[PDB]
Structure 1
Amino acid sequence: TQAEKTATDLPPGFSGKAGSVNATPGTKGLDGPTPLADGSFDATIFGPAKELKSADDILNVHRRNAKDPFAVGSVDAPLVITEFSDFECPFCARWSNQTEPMLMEEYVSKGLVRIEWNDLPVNGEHALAAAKAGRAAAAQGKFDEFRKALFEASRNVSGHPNNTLKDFERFARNAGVKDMERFSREAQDSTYDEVLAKAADYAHGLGVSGTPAFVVGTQYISGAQPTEEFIKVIESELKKSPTFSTPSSH
């Protein structure tokens, strides 16, 4: 027949990008995290939106907190990816270097997906120090840039980079962190000790057993799986839940 047909539903295995093409992008929180009173950002943010008591509560892991400097993408994006990660972990590096850029260009920059970082140090003293440096960067609104710079420096490393203070200071400089006195102080002192302990306890309480780990909407993914697998799950979740509406009672 001499017509172009409107797309109709297909089995999910062959649905391609039907999910994202029919989803409604978020329009709020496009200018990054909301600042604190003094202009800096709340780098003590961690944890879920609300306690999880059963599998029914899986969406509670997604904060959708507009003040969150550990998040990228619209606060009302129809899909959130919650990530648990370690800055010394080569699988975390691989996901950051090889999967996340595609997700950023295809989904996050289009308002469809929000990605929220959660600390889960599994690799000991260098991982803890890196997480502290990450929070120091987030306090100055440069977490994503710090994350990207650190992991790019690990793009050819199959083991742990064993980054130390001068490495973190370099990543911070490259990320455009403006107050290096504050960064170097907070990256080393007790400022974030408590929140990092609590963040680890939270992740362990979920039973997250290794890094990276993801909650993609309602779906759990363990490890740096192929990029194509992340895309399939993203599309499936967007097909299922194309829109998000912030509750009026919040």
Structure 2
Amino acid sequence: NDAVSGQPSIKGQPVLGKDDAPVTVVEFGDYKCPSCKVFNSDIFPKIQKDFIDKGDVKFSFVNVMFHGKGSRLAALASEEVWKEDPDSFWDFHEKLFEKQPDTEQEWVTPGLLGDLAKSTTKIKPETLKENLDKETFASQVEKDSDLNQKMNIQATPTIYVNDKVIKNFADYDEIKETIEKELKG
């Protein structure tokens, strides 16, 4: 009972990289996932430099709800940024992972998310914060949830390289080699 092999649809999802990048890397992640915090700092910048910058890979992120209410809030704020300020999306995304503490208990508040919006985006904190309260972008969260279930996501982050499921997100060798194999044929 693992993640299913197959190309996940990135239709309607946040993307970074050239439109015609031949390889799509998809992260199924969670803003409260400590491994996703590690992927963001340790692995993602290498994917950027080695592949995204040169147009080989486009990267996408799909929300997964494994850590309770804080995961939902963070997902909702994330969905709004992509919709309302796409060009700023990745600065907000990375700064949220960087704001994740190394402690267990809840930390995701509307106030924190609004403050990240303020510093990284065109979006007004009170606009976020109003939308979070009303759960305006719930449908985008449920869209991702449907996709997580279709792909049978068991743990975060789960990385896809085209139709290939990466066994270890923190093994950059596996990730680089799989991107390069996909790039060949």
TM-score class, shorter-chain normalisation, is: 0.7 to 0.9
In the alignment of these two chains, the number of paired residues is 180
Relative to 1, partners in 2 of residues 1:104 and 1:159: Cα closer, same or farther, differing over 3 Å? farther
**C-alpha RMSD of the superposition:** 2.1
Does structure 2 conserve the Cα–Cα contact (< 8 Å) formed by 1:132 and 1:188?
A: no
TM-score, reference length from structure 2: 0.87
Question: Residue 210 of structure 1 corresponds to which residue in structure 2?
Answer: 155
The separation in 1 between residues aligned to 2:135 and 2:123, in whole angstroms, is 21
Q: More relative contact order in 1 or in 2 (CA 8 Å, sep 6+)?
A: 2
Cα displacement string for residues 122-164 of structure 1 (whole angstroms, at most 9, x for unaligned residues): 111111111011112112223211111011223x626466221
Question: Residue 60 of structure 2 corresponds to which residue in structure 1?
Answer: 116
Could you say which structure has the larger radius of gyration? 1
Question: Residue 224 of structure 1 corresponds to which residue in structure 2?
Answer: 169
Among residues 96, 103, 111, which one is paired with 1:150 in the alignment?
Answer: 96
* 1:181 Cα deviation from its structure 2 partner: 3.2
The separation in 2 between residues aligned to 1:160 and 1:144, in whole angstroms, is 25
Among residues 95, 98, 108, which one is paired with 2:39 in the alignment?
Answer: 95
Relative to 1, partners in 2 of residues 1:173 and 1:192: Cα closer, same or farther, differing over 3 Å? same
Kindly indicate whether residue 137 of structure 2 is the aligned counterpart of residue 192 of structure 1: yes
SS of 1:77's equivalent?
A: coil
Question: Residue 182 of structure 2 corresponds to which residue in structure 1?
Answer: 237
TM-score, reference length from structure 1: 0.66
Among residues 93, 107, 112, which one is paired with 1:167 in the alignment?
Answer: 112
Unmatched runs of 5 consecutive residues or more in structure 2: none
Does structure 2 conserve the Cα–Cα contact (< 8 Å) formed by 1:71 and 1:116?
A: yes
SS of 2:40's equivalent?
A: helix
SS of 1:83's equivalent?
A: strand
Q: Greater share of helix residues, 1 or 2?
A: 2
Question: Residue 15 of structure 2 corresponds to which residue in structure 1?
Answer: 71
Among residues 128, 140, 144, which one is paired with 1:183 in the alignment?
Answer: 128
Does structure 2 conserve the Cα–Cα contact (< 8 Å) formed by 1:88 and 1:160?
A: no
More deviation in 192-201 or 205-214?
Answer: 192-201
The separation in 2 between residues aligned to 1:160 and 1:120, in whole angstroms, is 18
